[PDB]
C-alpha cells in the first residue's frame, strides 16, 4: 500500500549511500581524482579562485604544463569551464593584450587552444567568455580560425562531438561578424542588436567571480551599437504605415504579430527570420546578396544539426536564381564590381555546390564562353555529323606538324608569341587555339591516340626478338609520353591544389597508367639482360595488363559532355565512392566466414591405424549415416550465405536507385560546370607536348634576361593563367558598372520582397484562427 | 567491505554523476526545473487553445 | 522524487526520447569526452590512434 503504481515502475531501483559532501558542479566534482596538490594546474581544474591567486601572488607561474599532454594552466581552466579564474587573470595579472593572446593561443600536444578545448566539450559558460573577448577586441589573433593538427577548428569540434548548445553560440558570432562594424543604417543596427542580445540573454546566469555589479556578460558590447530599441520600434511602425518608406515595400523586417493569446527574449534559437535579418541587412550594407546566401549555407553545413535551415538557404539560392529572367540579370548578380570584389561563381566551384552549378542559367554562362560558335549543336543534324567529323581528322593531322613547331618557336621568336596572343576577346574560329571547346577536342584526340598505340603494342609484340625489343622506337616513345604525363600531374597538383585535384577522378588514372607503364618499361629492360628469371618477368606482364586497363577506362572520358552517357559516368563514379567501400568490407567478412567454414567441413580424418598411423580416409576437396550429416551443414552454410549476399545486393540496387532517380542530371551538369571552367583557365598544350616546352621555357625565358632584360610576354611555365578572370564580364569599368548596379537592385529587391511575403503567408496559415479571434476581441475591449 | 563484487554491470552506481544532488544544488535544480516545466505547460495551453 | 526517467526509457525501449539531440549529448560526455571517435576522419588520427 506504501508503493504506488508509478512508484514500482519509475523510481530508482537500488539502495544507495548518501555521500557526506559531494558537489555536482563542473569543477569540485573532481577533487578525489585530480587532487588538491596546489600547483595552479590543479587549482584551475578544480576552480579554486583563492588558491589560484595565492599560489600566483607568492609563487609559481601562469603557463606551466603537464608532460604527456601540453596543457597550460589556462587550458585546464577551460577544460572544466572555470571561467571564474580565466576572468580573474584577464582582469588582473595580465596587461599588454599581446600577453593575453599568447596565454590563450599557447598550444597543446594535439594542437588545441583556449577556444578549441572549451569547444570539444559543451562549455557554454566558458565559450560565451572567449566569444565575449573577441567582440570587445581583446585578442589580436582571431582565435577561432586556428586549426589543430587534425584539420579541425573551434566549430568542427563542437559539431562532431554533437554539442548543439555550443554550435548555436559559435554560429551567432559568425553571423555577427558578417555585418559591418561601422555603418550608419537604422536596420543593420537592429539586427546587430538582435544577435548580441541573443547571446547576452543566453549566458545571463554567469556571475562574475566576486560580488561586483553583475557585469552580466555582454555589457560592453551591447553598449557599443547605438540603437534605441524603442525609438527604432516606431521607425518601422511609421515607415510601414502606408506601404513603405524603407524603399523595400515596408520596413522590410516588420510584420504582424498581431498578438497571440493563452486562454483555456524568448526567440532564443536561430529561426529563419534570424537568417533573413542577415541577408536583408548584409545587402543593405553593400554586399553581394548571392555571396551571403552561399556563405551562410557553408556555415550551417559544418554545424551538422541544422538541416531545416540548410534546406531553406538552398531553396533561397535557387529562388534568387529564378527571379533572374535573362542572361543580362544573371551576370549582374554574380559579377564582382570594383566596390565588392566578391565572386559567387568561383566560390561555388570551390565548395562543390551541386544545386547552383546545375541550374539552367548557370549552365548558360559556361556554355556561352566555352562554345561560342555552336559546333556542339552541329552533331544533331544529318549534314553536320559528316562535315564535323571530317574537320577533326584534318585538324589533328594539322595539329601534328605545326604544334611541335609553334611550341619551339614561342620560346625563341618574339613575333610568333604576339601572334599567339590574339585572343582573350570575343574569341572565334579565326584563331582556334583560344576557344575552349577546341582545346578539349585536341585533348581527347591525343587520348584516343594513346590507347590505340598502347593496345597496338600488346598485339604487335613479337616474342622471338632480341634485346632491342626492350628499347624499340615505339616502346620508348610511349615511355616518354608517360614520363610527360607524370610531370603534368605534379603541375596541376601544385597549381590547383589538393581538394580540387582529388575531386575529378581522372587525375588518379592519369598517374596510375603512367606510373605502371614507366615501371613496365624499366623492369622489362632489367629482366632481359641482367637477371633473367620468371619471378620478376611475371610482374612485367602484370604491369602492362594493369596499364592497359586504365588506358581503356580513361577513354570513357569523351562521353562526359554527352547527355545520356554522361550520367552513366557519374552514377558509376559515385557508386565507387559512396557505396563500394562499405559493401566490400562486408562481402570480405561474409566470404572469409564462408571460406573458413568450408575448410572446417572438408577436413580429412584418420580412422585406420592399429599401432601408429596406418591410413586416413580421404574427404573431397578444399551406411553409417556419415556423408549425410556433413552435407546437411553444407546446405545450411551455402543457403544462408547466398541469401545473405542477395540481401546485400538488394541493398545496393536500392542505394543506386535513389541517386539515379533523384540526382542524375544534377551530377551530370555539375561535372560540365567543373569541366568548362578548367579548360577556361588552361593553355592549349597536351601531355606529350608540354615537356617539349618545359625544356624550352627553361631556356627561352633565360635568354631574354641576360642581354635584353625586361622583355615582356615571356612564356610562363606555370599553367592556369591567374592574371585573367574567369569570365569576360567580371569587372565593369564605367557605364557598364552603373547599369549592373541598376540591374542587381532591380532583381534582388524583388527576391527579398517575395520572401517577406512568402514567410508571412506561412505565419498566417498556422495562426489564422488567432487573427480572426483578435478581430472579435476588440468587441471585448473597444 | 569494498570487495571486488562478483558481477559485471555495477549496481552501486547511479549511471550519471549529476544524479541525486544533495545540498544547495538541490535548491538550484528545483528552481531550474520549475522554470522549464512551467514554460512547457503553457505552450501546450496555447496550442490547445488554437 | 527518486524517479529516474533515463533508466526507464532504456528499459521500455523508447526510441523517440532516447535519440534526441539532448539525450545523445548527456551520454556522449560520459562515453567519449575526448573525441577519440573522431580520430578516424584524418590521416594523423588513424596513424596515431591506431
Ligand atoms: C575492386 C574495384 C572494382 C572497381 C570496378 C571499376 C569498374 C570501372 C567502371 C568504369 C569506370 C568509369 C568510372 C570511373 C571514374 C572514376 O573517377 O573512378 C573512380 C575512382 C575513385 O576514386 P576517385 O579518383 O574518384 O577519388 C575520390 C573523388 O575525388 C571524390 O569526389 C572525393 O570526394 P570529394 O568530392 O569530397 O572530393 C574522394 O575523397 P573523399 O575521401 O572525401 O570521399 C576521392 O577519394 O576509382 C578509380 O579510379 C579506379 C576505377 C578503375 C580501377 C582501375 C585500376 C585497377 C587496376 C588493377 C588491375 C589489376 C591487374 C593486376 C594483375 C595483373
Ligand atoms: C581539332 C580541333 C577542332 C576543329 C573544329 C572541328 C569541328 C568542326 C566545326 C565545324 O563544323 O565548322 C564550322 C565552324 C563554325 O564556323 P561558322 O560558320 O559558325 O562561322 C565562323 C566564322 N567566323 C569566325 C568569322 C564567325 O567553323 C570552324 O570551326 C572552322 C573549321 C575548323 C578548321 C580549323 C580548326 C583548327 C583547330 C585547331 C587548331 C590546330 C592547332
Ligand atoms: C565529330 C564531333 C565534332 C563536334 C564535337 C562535339 C563535342 C561534344 O560535346 O559532343 C559529344 C558527342 C555528342 O554529344 P553532345 O555533346 O552533342 O550532347 C548534346 C549536347 O550536350 C547539347 O548541347 C545538349 O543540349 P543542351 O546543352 O542541354 O542545351 C544535348 O541535350 P538535348 O537538350 O539536345 O537533349 C546533348 O544531347 O558525344 C560523343 O559521342 C563523343 C564524341 C566526342 C568526339 C571526341 C573526338 C573524336
- Alpha carbon distance A773, A770 (integer Å): 5
The helix/strand/coil state of A499 is coil
Specify the DSSP element, H or E, that contains A593: helix A580-601
Q: How far apart are CA A79 and CA A108, in angstroms?
A: 12
Query: Helix/strand/coil (H, E, C) string of A51-80?
Result: HHHHHHHCCCCCCCCCCCCCCCCHHHHCCC
Check CB contact under 8 Å for C2 and B19: no
**Distances in Å between the alpha carbon of A543 and those of A291, A454, A513?**
49, 13, 9
Q: Which of B9, B10, B15 to mutate to probe the C interface, most C CBs <10 Å? A: B15
Query: Which ligand 1 atom is the nearest neighbour of the CA of A352?
Result: 35
Strand, helix or coil for residue A615: strand
Q: Are A169 and A199 in contact (CB under 8 A)?
A: yes
B25: contact with A, CB 8 A cutoff: yes
Helix, strand, coil shares, percent, chain A, to 5: 55, 0, 40
> A769 vs B42: CB contact, 8 Å cut-off?
no
Which chain B residues have a beta carbon less than 8 Å from that of C4?
14, 19
DSSP, res A577: I
Q: At what angle do helices A631-662 and A580-601 cross, to 10 degrees?
A: 170
Q: Which three cell numbers stand for residue A512?
A: 596510375
Copy the grid coordinates of residue A260: 497571440
C chain contacts of residue B19, beta-carbon cutoff 8 Å: 4
| SS3 state at A617 | strand
Nearest to B49 among A23, A24, A264 (CB): A264
Q: Which of A13, A120, A151 sits opposite C42 (nearest CB)?
A: A151
CB A757 within 8 A of CB A749: no
CA distance A313 to A324: 17
- Rounded to a whole number of angstroms, the distance between the first and last alpha carbons of chain B is 61
**CA angle A139–A142–A145, rounded 5-degree value:** 150
Q: Taking CB atoms and an 8 Å limit, are A22 and B18 in contact across chains?
A: no
Judge whether A769 is closer than 8 Å to chain B, CB to CB.
yes
CA distances to A16, A117, A572, C11, C31 from B7, in Å: 17, 37, 53, 20, 21
Q: Give the number of beta-carbon pairs within 8 Å between A and B.
A: 36
Alpha-carbon torsion (C21, C24, C27, C30), positive or negative: negative
Q: In this structure, what C-alpha cell is assigned to residue A81?
A: 569551464
CB–CB contact B16 C6 (8 Å): yes
Of all atoms in ligand 2, which is nearest to the CA of residue A378?
11
Cα-based angle A27, A43, A209 (whole degrees, multiple of 5): 70
Instruction: Give the three cell numbers for residue A471.
Output: 628499347
Using a CB-CB cut-off of 8 Å, the residues of chain C touching B16 are 6, 26, 30
Q: Nearest CA to A673 among A435, A443, A360? A: A360
Test site for ligand 3: of A559, A562, A671, most ligand atoms within 8 A of the Cβ: A562
Residue of the CA atom closest to atom 15 of ligand 1: A573
Kindly list the distances between the CA atom of residue A94 and the CA atoms of A99, A103, A186, A221, A704, in Å, as whole numbers in the listed order.
7, 9, 38, 21, 59
Residues 6+ apart with CB under 8 A from A496: A720
CA atoms of A717 and A289, how far apart (whole Å):
38
| Site from C1, C2, C3, C4 to mutate, B interface, most B CB atoms within 10 angstroms | C4
* Nearest chain A Cα distance for residue C44, angstroms: 6
Nearest by Cα to A278 from A289, A268, A262: A289
CB pairs under 8 A between A and C: 46
DSSP-derived letter for residue A766 is H
Neighbours of C12 (CB within 10 A): 10
Query: Are A160 and C38 spatial neighbours (Cβ–Cβ below 8 Å)?
Result: yes
**What's the distance, CA A340 to chain centroid?**
24
Distance CA A79, CA A37 (A): 18
Residue A360 C-beta-side C-alpha neighbours within 13 Å: 6
Q: Which three cell numbers stand for residue A130?
A: 572567449
**Rg (alpha carbons) of chain B, rounded to whole number:** 19
**In this structure, is the dihedral angle defined by the CA atoms of residues A385, A387, A390 and A396, taken in order, positive or negative?**
negative
**Which residue in chain A is spatially nearest to C1 when comparing CA positions?**
A11
Strands A605-608 and A615-617: antiparallel
Nearest by CB to B42, from A14, A262, A767: name it: A262
Which of A18, A29, A260 is the closest to B46 by Cβ?
A: A260
Provide long-range contacts, Cβ within 8 A and 24+ apart, for A304-307.
A304/A159, A304/A160, A304/A167, A305/A159, A305/A162, A305/A164, A305/A167, A305/C21, A306/A167, A306/A171, A306/A270
Pocket of ligand 3 (CB under 6 A): A 375-376, 379, 388-389, 392, 441, 444-445, 558-559, 561-563
Residue minimizing CA distance to atom 44 of ligand 3: A558
B15 and C26 in contact by Cβ < 8 A?
Answer: no
Mutate to test the interface with B, among C22, C29, C30 (most CBs of B within 10 A): C30
For chain A, positions 470-509, list CB contacts with chain C under 8 A.
Answer: none
Nearest CA, atom 34, ligand 2: A395
Per the CB < 8 A criterion, the answer to whether A688 and A399 are in contact is no
Looking at CA atoms only, how far is residue A515 from chain C in angstroms?
A: 24
CB contact under 8 A, A161 and C28: yes
Q: Calculate how far, in angstroms, residue A561's C-alpha sits from the geometric centre of ligand 3.
A: 6
Atom index in ligand 1 nearest the CA of residue A504 equals: 29
Q: Reduced to 3 states, what is the DSSP secondary structure of residue A606?
A: strand
| Header resolution in angstroms | 3.5
* CA separation for the pair A366, A680 (Å, rounded): 9
C-alpha span between A428 and A417 (Å, rounded): 18
Q: CB-based contacts of A110: which residues, under 8 Å, 6+ apart?
A: A69, A148, A149, A150
Contact list, B45 vs chain A (CB under 8 Å): 262-264
Query: Are the CB atoms for A427 and A679 separated by under 8 Å?
Result: no
Q: Whose CA is nearest to atom 45 of ligand 1?
A: A502
Cα separation, A252 vs A239, in Å, equals 10
Handedness of CA C38, C40, C44, C48 (dihedral sign): positive
Q: Distances from the Cα of A256 to the Cαs of A90, A250, A278, in angstroms?
A: 45, 12, 19
Contact A46, A30 (CB under 8 A): yes
Portion 261-290 of A in contact with B at CB < 8 A: 261-264
CA distance linking residue A675 with residue A272, whole number of Å: 35
- Other chains touching A, judged by 3 or more CB pairs under 8 Å: B, C
Q: Compute the nearest-CA separation of B10 from chain A (Å).
A: 11
Chain breaks in chain A (C to N over 2.5 A) after: 264, 622
Q: Which residues of A461-473 are buried (b: 16+ CB within 10 A; e: fewer)?
A: eeeeeeeeebeee
Task: Considering only the beta carbons, identify the residue of C2, C35, C42 that sits closest to A11.
Answer: C2
Find chains touching chain B: ≥3 CB pairs under 8 Å. Answer: A, C
**H or E stretch at A616:** strand A615-617
How many CB atoms are closer than 10 A to CB A307? 11
Q: How was this structure determined?
A: cryo-EM
Cβ separation A22–B22 shorter than 8 A: yes
Q: How many CB atoms lie within 10 A of CB A525?
A: 15
CA dist C42 and A751 (Å) reads: 41
Separation of CA A737 and ligand 1 centre (Å): 46
Q: Is A537 in the pocket of ligand 1 (CB under 6 A)?
A: no
Residue A384: count of CB within 10 angstroms of its CB: 13
Shortest Cα–Cα distance, C19 to chain B (Å): 17
Are the beta carbons of B16 and C7 separated by less than 8 Å? no
DSSP assignment string, A406-467: HHHHHHH-HHHHHHTT--SSS--TTSTTSSTTHHHHHHHHHHHHHHHHHHHHHHS--SS--G
Indicate if the alpha-carbon torsion angle A507, A513, A516, A521 is positive or negative. negative
**Separation of alpha carbons A587 and A595, rounded Å:** 12
Cell of B47: 496550442
Contact A48, A82 (CB under 8 A): no
Backbone interruptions in chain B following residues (C to N > 2.5 Å) = none
Contact between A25 and B25 using a beta-carbon 8 Å cutoff:
yes
Q: Which letter, b or e, does each residue of A76-101 get, where b requires 16 or more Cβ atoms within 10 Å of its Cβ?
A: bbbbbbbbbbbbbbbeeeeeeeeebb
Ligand 3, atom 37: closest residue by C-alpha? A563
Closest partner CB to B14 (pick from A16, A29, A260)? A16
Q: Given the C-alpha cell 565588392, which residue does it identify?
A: A340
Note whether A13 contacts C: Cβ–Cβ < 8 A: yes
Residues with CB under 6 A from ligand 2: A 373, 375, 378, 387-388, 391-392, 395-396, 398-399, 403, 428-430, 432-433, 438, 441-442
| Residue nearest atom 18 in ligand 3 by C-alpha distance | A562
Amino acid at each position: 500500500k506504501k508503493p504506488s503504481d508509478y512508484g514500482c515502475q519509475l523510481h530508482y531501483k537500488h539502495a544507495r549511500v548518501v555521500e557526506p559532501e559531494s558537489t555536482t558542479d563542473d569543477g569540485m566534482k573532481r577533487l578525489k581524482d585530480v587532487g588538491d596538490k596546489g600547483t595552479l594546474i590543479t587549482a584551475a581544474e578544480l576552480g579554486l579562485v583563492d588558491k589560484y591567486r595565492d599560489l600566483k601572488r607568492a609563487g609559481q607561474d601562469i603557463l606551466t604544463c603537464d608532460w604527456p599532454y601540453h596543457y597550460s594552466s589556462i587550458l585546464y581552466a577551460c577544460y572544466g569551464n572555470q571561467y571564474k579564474i580565466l576572468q580573474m587573470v584577464e582582469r588582473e595579472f595580465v596587461g599588454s593584450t599581446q600577453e593575453l593572446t599568447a596565454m590563450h593561443t599557447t598550444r597543446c600536444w594535439v594542437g588545441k587552444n583556449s577556444a578549441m578545448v572549451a569547444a570539444y566539450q559543451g562549455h557554454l559558460e566558458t565559450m560565451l567568455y572567449i566569444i565575449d573577448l573577441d567582440m570587445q577586441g581583446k585578442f589580436t589573433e582571431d582565435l577561432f580560425k586556428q586549426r589543430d593538427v587534425m584539420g579541425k577548428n573551434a566549430m568542427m569540434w563542437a559539431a562532431s562531438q554533437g554539442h548543439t548548445d555550443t554550435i548555436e553560440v559559435l554560429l551567432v558570432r559568425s553571423l555577427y561578424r558578417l555585418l559591418p562594424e561601422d555603418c550608419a543604417d537604422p536596420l543593420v543596427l537592429k539586427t546587430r542588436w538582435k544577435l548580441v542580445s541573443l547571446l547576452a540573454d543566453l549566458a545571463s546566469h554567469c556571475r562574475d567571480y566576486d560580488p561586483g555589479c553583475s557585469r552580466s556578460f555582454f555589457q560592453e558590447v551591447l553598449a557599443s551599437i547605438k540603437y534605441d530599441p524603442v525609438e527604432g520600434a516606431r521607425q518601422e511602425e511609421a515607415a510601414a504605415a502606408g506601404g513603405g518608406g524603407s524603399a523595400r515595400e515596408g520596413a522590410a523586417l516588420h510584420e504582424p504579430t498581431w498578438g497571440v493569446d493563452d486562454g483555456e527574449l524568448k526567440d532564443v534559437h536561430i529561426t529563419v527570420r534570424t537568417l533573413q535579418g542577415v541577408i536583408v541587412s548584409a545587402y543593405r550594407a553593400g554586399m553581394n546578396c548571392m555571396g551571403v546566401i552561399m556563405y551562410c549555407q557553408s556555415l550551417l553545413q559544418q554545424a551538422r544539426y541544422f538541416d531545416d535551415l540548410v534546406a531553406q538557404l538552398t531553396a533561397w539560392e535557387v529562388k534568387l536564381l529564378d527571379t533572374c529572367r535573362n542572361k543580362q540579370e544573371v551576370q549582374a548578380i554574380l559579377a564582382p564590381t570594383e566596390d565588392d570584389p566578391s565572386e559567387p561563381v568561383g566560390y561555388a566551384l570551390a565548395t562543390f555546390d551541386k544545386a547552383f552549378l546545375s541550374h539552367k542559367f548557370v549552365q548558360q554562362i559556361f556554355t556561352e564562353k566555352w562554345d561560342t560558335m555552336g559546333v556542339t549543336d552541329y552533331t544533331k543534324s544529318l549534314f553536320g555529323v559528316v562535315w564535323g567529323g571530317c574537320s577533326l581528322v584534318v585538324a589533328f593531322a594539322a595539329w601534328a606538324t605545326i604544334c611541335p613547331l609553334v611550341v619551339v618557336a614561342r620560346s625563341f621568336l618574339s613575333p610568333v608569341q604576339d601572334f599567339m596572343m590574339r585572343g582573350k576577346v570575343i574569341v572565334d574560329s579565326r584563331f582556334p587555339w583560344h576557344v575552349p571547346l577546341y582545346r578539349w577536342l585536341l585533348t581527347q584526340c591525343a587520348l584516343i591516340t594513346f590507347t590505340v598505340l598502347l593496345s597496338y603494342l600488346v598485339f604487335s609484340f613479337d616474342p622471338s626478338d632480341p634485346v632491342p625489343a626492350s628499347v624499340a622506337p615505339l616502346n620508348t616513345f610511349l615511355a616518354v609520353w608517360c614520363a610527360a604525363i607524370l610531370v603534368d600531374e605534379v603541375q596541376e597538383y601544385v597549381e590547383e591544389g589538393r581538394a580540387e585535384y582529388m575531386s575529378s577522378g581522372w587525375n588518379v588514372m592519369d598517374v596510375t597508367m603512367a606510373l605502371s607503364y614507366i615501371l613496365h618499361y624499366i623492369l622489362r629492360i632489367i629482366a632481359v639482360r641482367v637477371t633473367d628469371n620468371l619471378n620478376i618477368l611475371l610482374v612485367v606482364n602484370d604491369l602492362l595488363a594493369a596499364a592497359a586497363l586504365m588506358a581503356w577506362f580513361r577513354m570513357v572520358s569523351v562521353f562526359e559532355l554527352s547527355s545520356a552517357i554522361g550520367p552513366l559516368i557519374q552514377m558509376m563514379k559515385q557508386m565507387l565512392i559512396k557505396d563500394v567501400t562499405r559493401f566490400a568490407l562486408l562481402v570480405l567478412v561474409i566470404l572469409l566466414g564462408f571460406s573458413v567454414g568450408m575448410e572446417a567441413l572438408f577436413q580429412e580424418a584418420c580412422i585406420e591405424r592399429d599401432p601408429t598411423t596406418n591410413e586416413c580416409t580421404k574427404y573431397t576437396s578444399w551406411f553409417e549415416q556419415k556423408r549425410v550429416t556433413g552435407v546437411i551443414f553444407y546446405l545450411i552454410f551455402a543457403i544462408v550465405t547466398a541469401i545473405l549476399l542477395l540481401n546485400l545486393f538488394i541493398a545496393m540496387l536500392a542505394d543506386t536507385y535513389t541517386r539515379v532517380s533523384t540526382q542524375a542530371m544534377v551530377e551530370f551538369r555539375y561535372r560540365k560546370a567543373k569541366l568548362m571552367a578548367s579548360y577556361s583557365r588552361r593553355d592549349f598544350v597536351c601531355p606529350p607536348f608540354n615537356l617539349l616546352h618545359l625544356v624550352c621555357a627553361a631556356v627561352g625565358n633565360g635568354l631574354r634576361r641576360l642581354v635584353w632584360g625586361p622583355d615582356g610576354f615571356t612564356p610562363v611555365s606555370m599553367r592556369k593563367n591567374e592574371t585573367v578572370p574567369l569570365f569576360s564580364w567580371y569587372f565593369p569599368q564605367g557605364e557598364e558598372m552603373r547599369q549592373v548596379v541598376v540591374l542587381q537592385r532591380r532583381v534582388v529587391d524583388d527576391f527579398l520582397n517575395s520572401n517577406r511575403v512568402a514567410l508571412f503567408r506561412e505565419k498566417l496559415n498556422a495562426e489564422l484562427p488567432n487573427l480572426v479571434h483578435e478581430m472579435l476581441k476588440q468587441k471585448g475591449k473597444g
